[PDB]
Amino acid sequence: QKHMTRTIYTSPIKALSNQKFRDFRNTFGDVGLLTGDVQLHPEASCLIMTTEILRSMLYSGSDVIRDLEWVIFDEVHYINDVERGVVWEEVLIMLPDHVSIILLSATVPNALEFADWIGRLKRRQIYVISTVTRPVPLEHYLFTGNSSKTQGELFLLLDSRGAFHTKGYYAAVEAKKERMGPAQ
Amino acid sequence: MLFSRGLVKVLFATETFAMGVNMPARTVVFDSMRKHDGSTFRDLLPGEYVQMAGRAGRRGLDPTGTVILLCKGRVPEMADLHRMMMGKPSQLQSQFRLTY
Amino acid sequence: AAIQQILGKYKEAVAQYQMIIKKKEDYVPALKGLGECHLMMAKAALVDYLDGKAVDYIEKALEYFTCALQHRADVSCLWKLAGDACTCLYAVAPSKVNVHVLGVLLGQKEGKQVLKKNELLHLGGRCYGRALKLMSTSNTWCDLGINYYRQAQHLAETGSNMNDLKELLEKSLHCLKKAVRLDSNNHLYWNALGVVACYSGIGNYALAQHCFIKSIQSEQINAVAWTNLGVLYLTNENIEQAHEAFKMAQSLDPSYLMCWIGQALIAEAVGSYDTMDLFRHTTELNMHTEGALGYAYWVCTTLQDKSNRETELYQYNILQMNAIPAAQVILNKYVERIQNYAPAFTMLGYLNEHLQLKKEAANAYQRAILLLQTAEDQDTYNVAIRNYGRLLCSTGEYDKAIQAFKSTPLEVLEDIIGFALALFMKGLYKESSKAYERALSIVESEQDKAHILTALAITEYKQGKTDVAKTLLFKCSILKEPTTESLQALCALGLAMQDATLSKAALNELLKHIKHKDSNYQRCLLTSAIYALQGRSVAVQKQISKAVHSNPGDPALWSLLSRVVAQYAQRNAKGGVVAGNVAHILDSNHGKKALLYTAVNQLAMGSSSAEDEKNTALKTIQKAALLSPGDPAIWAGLMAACHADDKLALVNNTQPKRIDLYLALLSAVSASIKDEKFFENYNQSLEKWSLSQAVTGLIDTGRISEAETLCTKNLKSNPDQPAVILLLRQVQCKPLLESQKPLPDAVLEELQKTVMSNSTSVPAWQWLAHVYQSQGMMRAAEMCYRKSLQLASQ
Amino acid sequence: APDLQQEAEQLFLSSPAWLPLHGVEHSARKWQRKTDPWSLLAVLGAPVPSDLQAQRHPTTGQILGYKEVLLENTNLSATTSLSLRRPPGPASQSLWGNPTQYPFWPGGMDEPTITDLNTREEAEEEIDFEKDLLTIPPGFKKGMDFAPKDCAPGLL
Amino acid sequence: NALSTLRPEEIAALLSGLVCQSPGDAGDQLPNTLKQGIERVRAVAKRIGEVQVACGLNQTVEEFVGELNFGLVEVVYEWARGMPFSELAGLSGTPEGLVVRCIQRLAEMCRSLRGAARLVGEPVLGAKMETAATLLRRDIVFAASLYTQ
Amino acid sequence: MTNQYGILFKQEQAHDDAIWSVAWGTNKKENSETVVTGSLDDLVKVWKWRDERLDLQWSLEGHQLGVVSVDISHTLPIAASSSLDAHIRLWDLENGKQIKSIDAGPVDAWTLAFSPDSQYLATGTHVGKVNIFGVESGKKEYSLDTRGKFILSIAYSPDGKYLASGAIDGIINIFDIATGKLLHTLEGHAMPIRSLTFSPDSQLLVTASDDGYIKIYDVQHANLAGTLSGHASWVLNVAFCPDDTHFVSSSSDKSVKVWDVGTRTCVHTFFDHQDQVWGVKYNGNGSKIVSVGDDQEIHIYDCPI
């Protein structure tokens, strides 16, 4: 929006691209949404699309492609799907040269044999950024029933530091031993 | 829209909630370890669990987040639970094919 | 502004350019942009058939281009665009172009000038020549060749000359050949050369085929060249190969109009079944002329065949795609575009007649008459005359119809019948009888003989002479099979007489062996009227109840039941109200009459309800008044509703409302009556009743002066009629006897005399007896009441 | 509404117009069909080769004056070329689902190699228009043979 | 000429067999016209699969034609007549989300066929597809989203 | 490919009986958004669409019978209403109090329409004429005459210089305010008209007659550009969009369709009313629709720009 250009945000799930529309319209200015029938503001600068529509307006001209800067492929780990993975590769080839790409992902191992493919399919250098250690870590507990009235005991078998605890698992199974669908 | 303002306290969601929305909550509780994908009634794979587990912690409104598994029927069977709770998520394939 | 122009959005670009122009006036690019925008708007107008708008826009564009050319006249593009603007007005139906060119363009700078078509095109050729002179490029050469072609086409098409335009065509070919040799790698030049080379005046087909093939080779994506080859082969009786070429053309561009039209023509030639649909698709695409005429022809032909109306061809296509209105709009555009072809006008008249737009159909036939005078003089001109006269007679202007029917040989049944009916409409009944007799002479299709006999009976009756009508209708009855038309007229004739003995026989005859009549409402009306004739007056409602029981649909029957119960035997008010409501529910366009009748029934009922809102008499009568504010009954019903509401509110004792509006309603009633065709007795009764009710209401509310002036004005019109004078007596004697007072026998005697004048009216007598009671004459008041009771019972 | 008897008399004995004899039917009229397939021929015009582009002072650029120059990327259309120089499109139009339009270059492909240096202005090639006429459409097996027709100006 | 000669309220039910993605079965209480249109659709699918497998493709005719899974024919036929939602909910045992999703995925095809019937040159399919679409979407099946406006 | 249409608000029972006309005016320069509606009562209730809902503001009434047409003005705060009561009393819309009262019966006025500059308040009479009163300045300066039948609809081009009048039996008359001389008379339909409207920029006149068709004429000539036929009963009102691209038509078949004039086709139909829909309007920059109906309801739709 600062450069006056246009940007296309594409997410695979049809229901996921509605709350994104609301939050992007609330955060700043004009954000159009395009789907199979809805065409809310097909004049804004943040058109939100499902990839099956961008693949349909890449084969014709559609005269929007003349103004793009960024294509924010949101969840690019759906390429591994068997019935929609061909869409991401019909799209990533047909993009003209002046349109930069942003690929958000979900920490896959072989990120350097994929960004290398897109880097030498076009002829621009692509930078790979990978992170670990999500904030607010999570403790994986295990709940085994006992004294259902009030008593609840939770056994910790994984902690905020990633160390597997076999002691907790053995404690849990041993706890189950002593006792020995909808009503339970 | 009633879960994003804290006016509902328990959500009996399914996988479509696990994909189609974000709406983080404090404590995620599972109900089983195996699902029925392709009529083989397989075990839940490592890459999936990470997503549901990830929407456990909130941002600055709590120290951590607790993911509670709820094994009830039989023993947890720690052998495959090890590879389920930790494991490299998945490689990156390419499902290219020709259409009309 | 220029960027907005590129992307369409012509209005915004025009506005921006005007804003620039207001500040600075010599800014050449702004003027050029304004000229280009207006020219493009003109071309868009010519894509549709709004030729007048296009002429206006091109006039304005010429204004801007000459203004720009005054300052800097060395640039070439300005001259080229000026020539484009002027010569893009070909095929615009001359006598529609008068263009106000002014200034430098016509050499010397004198005032203004108004140019017709040929002069405008010649100026176009001159401007292209000037533009080319100072910058020799290919595009201007090709455009100049096209301009010369257009000029020759216009000269030939107006029949103004022939064989004296040879040099013009030679010049056009020279220019086009120069353009193509200058750069022989552009499909546009080869295609233009091909089209010009095959014009009817030159007729060099080998060059045309060679040019189109070269055009296709130059750029494979070429729908225009393929469809032109299709046209060339198709006109030279090679339907198969032309079909192949057209199929290729539409394969390369699925929404090009000419290829679809060619496919439709080929389908028509080889006699297929989906030619009508192909023409319909062409009509839906972009309004070309040939497809327009084809579709109109097919719709009219489909309408003619009367074995169709179950086929799902006629039913779906015609009655569910609204084919008729589309055909009418199409023909209007075509006719204004071409306007020298008679069958188009006749087809337009026919379709307008089916839409009941009679005035426009009359105009169409009139123009067709004008076209067809000096070319054929055969049956076609006579048929057009009969149609125009018949339709003119259908909507007033009888004298013109008679005059038109004069100018034809009255030797076929149609013309004589049309003449006879026009004569009957104007008057002159003897003439109509003679004309019908002559038409009777030349008769086949005995059905028509029966119809002519019935018309004879009807027309001569209006002179009197009823006996000959009766015997003549019997003569018609002696024919082999009854016609369901003469029998109805016979019953109506019986009703026009009295002593309905033959009427009963006619009704029995009608019912006996005739079932193909599908109205089911006229028969009920005739039966009810027959029962009413004998004064029975209760059987009538019973009979209509039987008829509605037989066919519980047909809203009309329910509505008629409501009307009859309101009129005869007005003691089944509840049943009448229910019947009127049911008639209203089962449709919408019967709203008017059903609402009127239910309102009157509620008035008759009183207030025997649950004191519920939204369903009193006032609400329903207001609803009816909103539906059709044309008839005179609804307003009188409104006055009665207001008075009844006032009395009911007074009984409930909360507040009298709706006090002073009676005079306005009376004026509305009279004004509405003025435009009613003829129900003379009914209209007289309605006006009289409205007058009486208004006077009584004004007396009650307390506006004595207005009632007095109204009565005096009415009496000043005509000599006395014993009804209104009683009203004036009532208005006079209201102030006195209100306050207790004693009156002299002279006044009492005069009032008694006035009531006696107009007898057979229970109200008046009851009011006089009330007067006796007020002053005090008890036994006399009892006698007056007894007389009123006897009169009412009798 | 008026009482029955006079209403019926009006309904039937008012005039003979109501008879099926005087209706829109009962004539069985005919029209003649006249095709005219020569109208289908379409001739398109050439575009304007000039724009009145501005001039710019080489330093501290200001528009000195407007000079006319020749455009270079005409004869290029939205349905027969794929580059970012073609005219935008027909008009305001449906965003997608439009056959008969060409996508832009897919980014890894350039595909332009030619010089063709003649650059003449009087390049009239002396084309023969009546010696050997090409009479086979591209794609057919045979065309049509028309008979030959037997039997350089100046102005100010 | 399969679809051209049917009612506009029946073509929606015939096209419902391409979209439902639900366990499928035949029916009993169906008119003759629907029960023969089903035969027409299955015969065309058999023809396409027979020309597919006779060329070198590896997808047996049964596997191609088994994607046609009717079983919402009765519900769509009753829905495009004026039946309110409650009776539809009662009618059959499928969760009322998997029905609204099917109807929403059908009203986007009975409008993309309006775009092709104008392109082929079939002006009689256009006047039926612009009816079967406007007659199909009226109520909570097509209720507007909350966090959209 | 169409926009996102849908309801925004639904008033349950505005009045006690049918609602016969509606006028939406964003008259004041600030954010006013005033809706004035009249019904089969004396009530002329004046609503205000504040943020997300309609809040009743005035309940003013002075009439004796049902009001058949109401009107609002864009320049001043003012409103006018006429009824079967033979009175054209025009309210104040600020204090909810009557300003004037003009005596005129069903032979002198049927339906109201203000001037573009809110000065003249023309109405259609019974004997064929059009009577132009003067607001704030008295009564009956002049009346244009067309020799015809009862006249139902009166419209003004929103740049002045044109006045249109439909009539019972179909014929259409176009006057020019400059001289008051009949330019040309269209013959139009075969049943009453009861609705007319010009378009912004005043070069396209859209009728809606009683048989179901919607002619789209063209002004400054008699060219017609097509007939829109998609309804199944009478058509009772037509309101034309602020930009010359759509218009809304409400019919007596309990459905309010929205057409577009470019291609003469119906984009979206609303099936939400349960009885005849007697009034539809747009708002300012047209993005919302009002539809008052015979059943006592006020619907407000959402038509994105």
PDB file of C-alpha atoms in Angstrom, chain D:
ATOM      1  CA  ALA D   1     -71.845  -2.452 -10.825  1.00  0.00           C
ATOM      2  CA  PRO D   2     -74.947  -2.256 -13.031  1.00  0.00           C
ATOM      3  CA  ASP D   3     -77.787  -4.733 -12.977  1.00  0.00           C
ATOM      4  CA  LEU D   4     -77.601  -7.892 -15.007  1.00  0.00           C
ATOM      5  CA  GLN D   5     -79.959  -7.403 -17.953  1.00  0.00           C
ATOM      6  CA  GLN D   6     -78.481  -4.206 -19.382  1.00  0.00           C
ATOM      7  CA  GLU D   7     -75.000  -5.550 -18.654  1.00  0.00           C
ATOM      8  CA  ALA D   8     -75.700  -8.626 -20.789  1.00  0.00           C
ATOM      9  CA  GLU D   9     -77.235  -6.510 -23.547  1.00  0.00           C
ATOM     10  CA  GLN D  10     -74.062  -4.431 -23.615  1.00  0.00           C
ATOM     11  CA  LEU D  11     -71.922  -7.556 -23.518  1.00  0.00           C
ATOM     12  CA  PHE D  12     -73.488  -9.067 -26.652  1.00  0.00           C
ATOM     13  CA  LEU D  13     -75.585  -6.584 -28.672  1.00  0.00           C
ATOM     14  CA  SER D  14     -73.397  -3.491 -28.319  1.00  0.00           C
ATOM     15  CA  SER D  15     -71.629  -3.987 -31.659  1.00  0.00           C
ATOM     16  CA  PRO D  16     -70.490  -6.788 -33.984  1.00  0.00           C
ATOM     17  CA  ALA D  17     -66.833  -6.184 -33.060  1.00  0.00           C
ATOM     18  CA  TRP D  18     -66.713  -8.978 -30.468  1.00  0.00           C
ATOM     19  CA  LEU D  19     -67.445 -11.640 -33.100  1.00  0.00           C
ATOM     20  CA  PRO D  20     -64.630 -14.038 -34.039  1.00  0.00           C
ATOM     21  CA  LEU D  21     -65.136 -12.607 -37.522  1.00  0.00           C
ATOM     22  CA  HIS D  22     -63.276  -9.355 -36.800  1.00  0.00           C
ATOM     23  CA  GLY D  23     -60.414 -10.698 -34.683  1.00  0.00           C
ATOM     24  CA  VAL D  24     -56.673 -10.554 -35.197  1.00  0.00           C
ATOM     25  CA  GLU D  25     -56.942 -14.078 -36.605  1.00  0.00           C
ATOM     26  CA  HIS D  26     -59.066 -15.013 -39.637  1.00  0.00           C
ATOM     27  CA  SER D  27     -56.761 -13.523 -42.245  1.00  0.00           C
ATOM     28  CA  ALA D  28     -53.845 -15.972 -42.708  1.00  0.00           C
ATOM     29  CA  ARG D  29     -51.445 -13.389 -44.117  1.00  0.00           C
ATOM     30  CA  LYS D  30     -48.108 -14.173 -45.766  1.00  0.00           C
ATOM     31  CA  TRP D  31     -44.685 -12.547 -46.013  1.00  0.00           C
ATOM     32  CA  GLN D  32     -41.773 -13.114 -48.369  1.00  0.00           C
ATOM     33  CA  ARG D  33     -38.234 -13.978 -47.311  1.00  0.00           C
ATOM     34  CA  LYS D  34     -35.334 -11.938 -48.695  1.00  0.00           C
ATOM     35  CA  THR D  35     -31.839 -12.877 -47.553  1.00  0.00           C
ATOM     36  CA  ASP D  36     -28.915 -10.520 -48.176  1.00  0.00           C
ATOM     37  CA  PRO D  37     -25.620 -12.236 -47.343  1.00  0.00           C
ATOM     38  CA  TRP D  38     -23.386  -9.508 -48.784  1.00  0.00           C
ATOM     39  CA  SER D  39     -23.916  -7.385 -45.671  1.00  0.00           C
ATOM     40  CA  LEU D  40     -21.781  -9.754 -43.584  1.00  0.00           C
ATOM     41  CA  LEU D  41     -18.526  -8.433 -45.088  1.00  0.00           C
ATOM     42  CA  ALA D  42     -16.541  -6.544 -42.445  1.00  0.00           C
ATOM     43  CA  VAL D  43     -13.725  -4.056 -43.068  1.00  0.00           C
ATOM     44  CA  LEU D  44     -11.594  -2.870 -40.162  1.00  0.00           C
ATOM     45  CA  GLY D  45      -9.586   0.336 -40.060  1.00  0.00           C
ATOM     46  CA  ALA D  46      -5.923   0.868 -39.300  1.00  0.00           C
ATOM     47  CA  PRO D  47      -4.771   2.562 -36.071  1.00  0.00           C
ATOM     48  CA  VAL D  48      -3.331   6.063 -35.728  1.00  0.00           C
ATOM     49  CA  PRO D  49       0.507   6.199 -35.961  1.00  0.00           C
ATOM     50  CA  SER D  50       1.192   9.312 -33.869  1.00  0.00           C
ATOM     51  CA  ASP D  51       0.878  10.534 -30.294  1.00  0.00           C
ATOM     52  CA  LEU D  52       2.207  14.108 -29.729  1.00  0.00           C
ATOM     53  CA  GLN D  53       4.704  13.136 -27.057  1.00  0.00           C
ATOM     54  CA  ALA D  54       6.220  15.818 -24.853  1.00  0.00           C
ATOM     55  CA  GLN D  55       9.777  17.119 -24.884  1.00  0.00           C
ATOM     56  CA  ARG D  56      12.023  17.438 -21.856  1.00  0.00           C
ATOM     57  CA  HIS D  57      14.867  19.849 -21.214  1.00  0.00           C
ATOM     58  CA  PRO D  58      17.937  17.636 -20.611  1.00  0.00           C
ATOM     59  CA  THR D  59      18.610  19.392 -17.285  1.00  0.00           C
ATOM     60  CA  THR D  60      15.926  20.351 -14.761  1.00  0.00           C
ATOM     61  CA  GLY D  61      13.390  18.764 -17.070  1.00  0.00           C
ATOM     62  CA  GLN D  62      10.506  20.959 -18.174  1.00  0.00           C
ATOM     63  CA  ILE D  63       8.112  20.413 -21.056  1.00  0.00           C
ATOM     64  CA  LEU D  64       9.428  22.735 -23.757  1.00  0.00           C
ATOM     65  CA  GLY D  65       6.908  21.666 -26.387  1.00  0.00           C
ATOM     66  CA  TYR D  66       4.990  18.738 -27.790  1.00  0.00           C
ATOM     67  CA  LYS D  67       6.445  16.949 -30.813  1.00  0.00           C
ATOM     68  CA  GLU D  68       4.707  14.204 -32.767  1.00  0.00           C
ATOM     69  CA  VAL D  69       6.499  10.855 -33.008  1.00  0.00           C
ATOM     70  CA  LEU D  70       5.685   7.429 -34.402  1.00  0.00           C
ATOM     71  CA  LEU D  71       4.296   4.730 -32.169  1.00  0.00           C
ATOM     72  CA  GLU D  72       6.076   1.390 -32.324  1.00  0.00           C
ATOM     73  CA  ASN D  73       3.923  -1.257 -30.642  1.00  0.00           C
ATOM     74  CA  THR D  74       0.737  -1.173 -32.688  1.00  0.00           C
ATOM     75  CA  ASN D  75      -0.540  -4.194 -34.675  1.00  0.00           C
ATOM     76  CA  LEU D  76      -0.321  -6.042 -31.351  1.00  0.00           C
ATOM     77  CA  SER D  77      -3.507  -7.224 -29.690  1.00  0.00           C
ATOM     78  CA  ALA D  78      -4.705  -8.828 -26.494  1.00  0.00           C
ATOM     79  CA  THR D  79      -5.700 -12.092 -28.186  1.00  0.00           C
ATOM     80  CA  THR D  80      -2.683 -12.629 -30.432  1.00  0.00           C
ATOM     81  CA  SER D  81       0.404 -11.593 -28.448  1.00  0.00           C
ATOM     82  CA  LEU D  82       1.781 -12.227 -24.969  1.00  0.00           C
ATOM     83  CA  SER D  83       3.859  -9.370 -23.558  1.00  0.00           C
ATOM     84  CA  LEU D  84       3.360  -6.293 -21.416  1.00  0.00           C
ATOM     85  CA  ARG D  85       2.886  -3.970 -24.382  1.00  0.00           C
ATOM     86  CA  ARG D  86      -0.462  -5.093 -25.773  1.00  0.00           C
ATOM     87  CA  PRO D  87      -3.560  -2.906 -25.388  1.00  0.00           C
ATOM     88  CA  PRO D  88      -5.273  -3.525 -22.045  1.00  0.00           C
ATOM     89  CA  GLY D  89      -8.422  -5.324 -23.142  1.00  0.00           C
ATOM     90  CA  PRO D  90     -11.923  -4.916 -24.563  1.00  0.00           C
ATOM     91  CA  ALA D  91     -13.400  -2.941 -21.647  1.00  0.00           C
ATOM     92  CA  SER D  92     -14.173  -3.457 -17.994  1.00  0.00           C
ATOM     93  CA  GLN D  93     -14.524  -7.209 -18.098  1.00  0.00           C
ATOM     94  CA  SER D  94     -14.889 -10.397 -16.085  1.00  0.00           C
ATOM     95  CA  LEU D  95     -11.673 -11.012 -14.177  1.00  0.00           C
ATOM     96  CA  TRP D  96     -11.254 -14.682 -15.084  1.00  0.00           C
ATOM     97  CA  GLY D  97     -12.957 -17.406 -17.112  1.00  0.00           C
ATOM     98  CA  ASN D  98     -12.188 -15.792 -20.483  1.00  0.00           C
ATOM     99  CA  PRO D  99     -11.028 -18.016 -23.346  1.00  0.00           C
ATOM    100  CA  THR D 100      -9.498 -16.324 -26.379  1.00  0.00           C
ATOM    101  CA  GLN D 101      -6.872 -14.376 -24.467  1.00  0.00           C
ATOM    102  CA  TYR D 102      -3.162 -14.956 -24.026  1.00  0.00           C
ATOM    103  CA  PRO D 103      -1.296 -15.244 -20.716  1.00  0.00           C
ATOM    104  CA  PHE D 104       1.786 -13.187 -20.028  1.00  0.00           C
ATOM    105  CA  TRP D 105       5.258 -14.660 -20.345  1.00  0.00           C
ATOM    106  CA  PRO D 106       5.909 -17.283 -17.652  1.00  0.00           C
ATOM    107  CA  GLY D 107       9.068 -15.564 -16.424  1.00  0.00           C
ATOM    108  CA  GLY D 108      11.762 -18.059 -17.290  1.00  0.00           C
ATOM    109  CA  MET D 109      11.214 -17.450 -21.019  1.00  0.00           C
ATOM    110  CA  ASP D 110      12.164 -14.493 -23.250  1.00  0.00           C
ATOM    111  CA  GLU D 111      12.065 -15.848 -26.830  1.00  0.00           C
ATOM    112  CA  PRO D 112      13.059 -12.860 -28.968  1.00  0.00           C
ATOM    113  CA  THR D 113      15.780 -13.191 -31.624  1.00  0.00           C
ATOM    114  CA  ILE D 114      15.607 -11.312 -34.948  1.00  0.00           C
ATOM    115  CA  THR D 115      17.086  -8.207 -36.578  1.00  0.00           C
ATOM    116  CA  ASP D 116      15.558  -7.930 -40.095  1.00  0.00           C
ATOM    117  CA  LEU D 117      17.459  -4.749 -40.966  1.00  0.00           C
ATOM    118  CA  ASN D 118      16.029  -3.143 -44.092  1.00  0.00           C
ATOM    119  CA  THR D 119      14.453   0.015 -42.606  1.00  0.00           C
ATOM    120  CA  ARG D 120      13.435   1.410 -45.991  1.00  0.00           C
ATOM    121  CA  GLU D 121      10.659   3.923 -46.650  1.00  0.00           C
ATOM    122  CA  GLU D 122       9.900   3.383 -50.367  1.00  0.00           C
ATOM    123  CA  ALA D 123       9.978  -0.401 -50.071  1.00  0.00           C
ATOM    124  CA  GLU D 124       7.273  -1.088 -52.663  1.00  0.00           C
ATOM    125  CA  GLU D 125       8.025  -4.681 -53.594  1.00  0.00           C
ATOM    126  CA  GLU D 126       6.295  -4.729 -57.014  1.00  0.00           C
ATOM    127  CA  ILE D 127       3.685  -7.322 -56.101  1.00  0.00           C
ATOM    128  CA  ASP D 128       1.925  -8.982 -59.030  1.00  0.00           C
ATOM    129  CA  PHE D 129      -1.839  -9.031 -58.487  1.00  0.00           C
ATOM    130  CA  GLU D 130      -2.946 -10.824 -61.657  1.00  0.00           C
ATOM    131  CA  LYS D 131      -0.210 -13.211 -62.827  1.00  0.00           C
ATOM    132  CA  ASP D 132      -0.494 -16.267 -60.560  1.00  0.00           C
ATOM    133  CA  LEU D 133      -3.367 -16.154 -58.089  1.00  0.00           C
ATOM    134  CA  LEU D 134      -3.194 -18.263 -54.932  1.00  0.00           C
ATOM    135  CA  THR D 135      -6.422 -20.281 -54.703  1.00  0.00           C
ATOM    136  CA  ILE D 136      -6.150 -22.774 -51.836  1.00  0.00           C
ATOM    137  CA  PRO D 137      -7.289 -21.928 -48.292  1.00  0.00           C
ATOM    138  CA  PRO D 138      -4.934 -23.077 -45.537  1.00  0.00           C
ATOM    139  CA  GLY D 139      -6.472 -26.312 -44.262  1.00  0.00           C
ATOM    140  CA  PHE D 140      -8.701 -27.381 -47.147  1.00  0.00           C
ATOM    141  CA  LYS D 141      -8.026 -29.794 -50.003  1.00  0.00           C
ATOM    142  CA  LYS D 142      -9.455 -27.694 -52.835  1.00  0.00           C
ATOM    143  CA  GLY D 143     -10.665 -24.143 -53.142  1.00  0.00           C
ATOM    144  CA  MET D 144     -12.852 -22.608 -55.821  1.00  0.00           C
ATOM    145  CA  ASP D 145     -11.915 -21.571 -59.352  1.00  0.00           C
ATOM    146  CA  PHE D 146     -13.356 -18.263 -60.533  1.00  0.00           C
ATOM    147  CA  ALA D 147     -13.073 -17.128 -64.124  1.00  0.00           C
ATOM    148  CA  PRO D 148     -10.405 -14.480 -64.791  1.00  0.00           C
ATOM    149  CA  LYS D 149     -11.531 -10.920 -65.448  1.00  0.00           C
ATOM    150  CA  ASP D 150     -10.103  -9.072 -68.446  1.00  0.00           C
ATOM    151  CA  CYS D 151      -9.452  -5.308 -68.843  1.00  0.00           C
ATOM    152  CA  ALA D 152      -1.595   5.028 -61.700  1.00  0.00           C
ATOM    153  CA  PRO D 153      -3.376   8.340 -61.099  1.00  0.00           C
ATOM    154  CA  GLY D 154      -2.515  11.825 -59.865  1.00  0.00           C
ATOM    155  CA  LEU D 155      -4.169  14.549 -57.804  1.00  0.00           C
ATOM    156  CA  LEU D 156      -3.208  17.668 -55.873  1.00  0.00           C
TER     157      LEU D 156
END
